[PDB]
C-alpha cells in the first residue's frame, strides 16, 4: 500500500544544520498535504511544519518554536518531501516523522544535536560460561540509535533489545535471544548491529566459550 520512508538524519553540532527527506510510494504524492512531526520524550509528538499543494502555491505553515529555523519543501516529480533545519539547538534532538495528515506516518529519522562526537559501538558476544539464552553487548557508542537483529532478522521471536543507557556521553545496550538448546551451537546464531551515524555494520557470531 502506501509507504513513507525517511532518511538524512544523524548528528550535528549545536548551531549547525541538517536536511532530512522522505519518499512516499503507493499514492499520488502531489495530491497529499505533507507535514513533519517530531517526537522527543520531553515534548512528545510535536507538529513542526506542513506544506500544501501546487494549487495552493505550495503554501507552508510552521510551529512557532521553529519558524525562521526550518524550511519545508517538496518535489512532486520525485515524490519527496524535505525539511531544511538551520541553527539547531539541543532541544531539536528527536525522531522526525513524515506525517501525511491525517492518515499516514513514516518510520522516523533520528536527529541528534550535540557537541559530543560520533563513536562506533564495540560489539561483544554473550555466551553461557531446554532453551538457551544468548546475547550481544553493544558498548560505548554515540549518538543513538543502533539497531540489533539476530541472524539477519531470521530470529525474531524470543528476542528483545533493552533500552540504551547513557554514561559519559556514550550509550550501551544489550540484546538477548532465546533459542532451543540443541540448535546452538549446532546452528549458527549471529547478532547484527548497525550504527548509522558512524556507518558501522557489524556481525558477531556467538560461539560457546
Amino acid at each position: 500500500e502506501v509507504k513513507v520512508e525517511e532518511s538524512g538524519g544523524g548528528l550535528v553540532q549545536p548551531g549547525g544544520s541538517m536536511k532530512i527527506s522522505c519518499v512516499v510510494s503507493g499514492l499520488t504524492f502531489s495530491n497529499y498535504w505533507m507535514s513533519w512531526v517530531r517526537q522527543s520524550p520531553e515534548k512528545g509528538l510535536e507538529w513542526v511544519a506542513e506544506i500544501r499543494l501546487k494549487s495552493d502555491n505550495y503554501a507552508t505553515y510552521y510551529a512557532e518554536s521553529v519558524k525562521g529555523k526550518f524550511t519545508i519543501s517538496r518535489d512532486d516529480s520525485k515524490s519527496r518531501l524535505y525539511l531544511q533545519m538551520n541553527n539547531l539547538r539541543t532541544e531539536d534532538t528527536g525522531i522526525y516523522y513524515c506525517f501525511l495528515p491525517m492518515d499516514y506516518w513514516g518510520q522516523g529519522t533520528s536527529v541528534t544535536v550535540s557537541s559530543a562526537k560520533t563513536t562506533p559501538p564495540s560489539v561483544y558476544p554473550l555466551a553461557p560460561g531446554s532453551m538457551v539464552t544468548l546475547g550481544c553487548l553493544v558498548k560505548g557508542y554515540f549518538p543513538e540509535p543502533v539497531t540489533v537483529t539476530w541472524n539477519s532478522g531470521s530470529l525474531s521471536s524470543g528476542v528483545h533489545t533493552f533500552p540504551a543507557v547513557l554514561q559519559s556521553d556514550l550509550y550501551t545496550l544489550s540484546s538477548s535471544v532465546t533459542v532451543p538448546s540443541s540448535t546452538w551451537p549446532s546452528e549458527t546464531v549471529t547478532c547484527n548491529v548497525a550504527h548509522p551515524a558512524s556507518s558501522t555494520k557489524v556481525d558477531k557470531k556467538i560461539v560457546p566459550r
Binding site: 507535514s35 512531526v37 512528545g44 509528538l45 510535536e46 507538529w47 506542513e50 505553515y61 510551529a63 512557532e64 516523522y97 495528515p101 491525517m102 492518515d103 499516514y104 506516518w105 513514516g106 518510520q107 522516523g108 564495540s122 561483544y124 558476544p125 554473550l126 555466551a127 553461557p128 560460561g129 539464552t133 546475547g135 553487548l137 558498548k139 521471536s157 528483545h160 533493552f162 533500552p163 540504551a164 543507557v165 554514561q167 550501551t172 545496550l173 544489550s174 538477548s176 532465546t178 566459550r209
Partner: protein
C-alpha cells in the same frame, strides 16, 4: 494552541477485559458539517504511530471491531472491548480543526496477566572484551510479570552496586511480560582481582531470590 488532555497511564487491564481511555479538548472539535474531528493513534512499542480511529468513531482499515470510540465536541472515550496482548502501546488523541496540529500526551495501556517468575541468565566477559581492557558482566532477567523487580550483584560474596546499570523493556506485545538487563561494568584490571560473580533476582513470585553465578 488546542490542548488535548489525556492521562499518562491506565490501571492495568486484565487480558480479555475492557479498557477505556479518556481524552478532552480545550476547544470543541464538532464542526458545522456534523463531523467531530477527533482522531486516535496507536504507537506500539518500537513502532511509529498508526491511525486507529478517525472522525471520532470511524475505524481505520484493518482495525479490529474490538475498538470503538464515542464523544462530544470536547470529551472523548476509546474503548477496547476484550484486550489482547497485541493492543499494548501508547494511545494518542489528536484534533484536525486548525493549525497547529496538536496531540495528547499519550495514554499507555498496561495489560494485567498472571505473575511469572523471571528467567535469569548471567554472562561472563567475552575474551574479546578482555582484549580491549574491559570486563562487563551481564545479567538478563527475562519475561517476568509484574514489572517490579530487584537485582543484587555480588563479587566474592560481597554486594556490589558500583558500575551497575539497569534497563527495563516495555511490556511485551506477545506475552505481556517485562524483561530487564543489569550490566556490571568493570575494567579488566578490577575484574581480574576477584573470582566469583553473582546476580540475584528478587521478584514477588518468590520470597527467595533466583541466584546465578560464575567463577572467573
Amino acid at each position: 494552541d488546542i490542548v488535548m488532555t489525556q492521562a499518562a497511564f491506565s490501571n492495568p487491564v486484565t487480558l480479555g477485559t475492557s479498557a477505556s481511555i479518556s481524552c478532552r479538548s480545550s476547544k470543541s472539535l464538532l464542526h458545522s458539517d456534523g463531523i467531530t474531528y477527533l482522531y486516535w493513534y496507536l504507537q506500539k512499542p518500537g513502532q511509529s504511530p498508526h491511525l486507529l480511529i478517525y472522525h471520532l468513531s470511524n475505524l481505520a482499515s484493518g482495525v479490529p471491531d474490538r475498538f470503538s470510540s464515542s464523544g462530544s465536541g470536547t470529551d472523548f472515550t476509546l474503548r477496547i472491548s476484550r484486550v489482547e496482548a497485541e493492543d499494548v502501546g501508547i494511545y494518542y488523541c489528536a484534533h484536525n480543526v486548525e493549525l497547529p496540529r496538536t496531540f495528547g500526551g499519550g495514554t499507555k495501556l498496561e495489560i494485567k496477566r498472571a505473575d511469572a517468575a523471571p528467567t535469569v541468565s548471567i554472562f561472563p566477559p567475552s575474551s574479546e572484551q578482555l582484549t580491549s581492557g574491559g570486563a562487563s558482566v551481564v545479567c538478563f532477567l527475562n519475561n517476568f510479570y509484574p514489572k517490579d523487580i530487584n537485582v543484587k550483584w555480588k563479587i566474592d560474596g560481597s554486594e556490589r552496586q558500583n558500575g551497575v546499570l539497569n534497563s527495563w523493556t516495555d511490556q511485551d506485545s506477545k506475552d505481556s511480560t517485562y524483561s530487564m538487563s543489569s550490566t556490571l561494568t568493570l575494567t579488566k584490571d578490577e575484574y581480574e582481582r576477584h573470582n566469583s560473580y553473582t546476580c540475584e533476582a528478587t521478584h514477588k513470585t518468590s520470597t527467595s531470590p533466583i541466584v546465578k553465578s560464575f567463577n572467573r
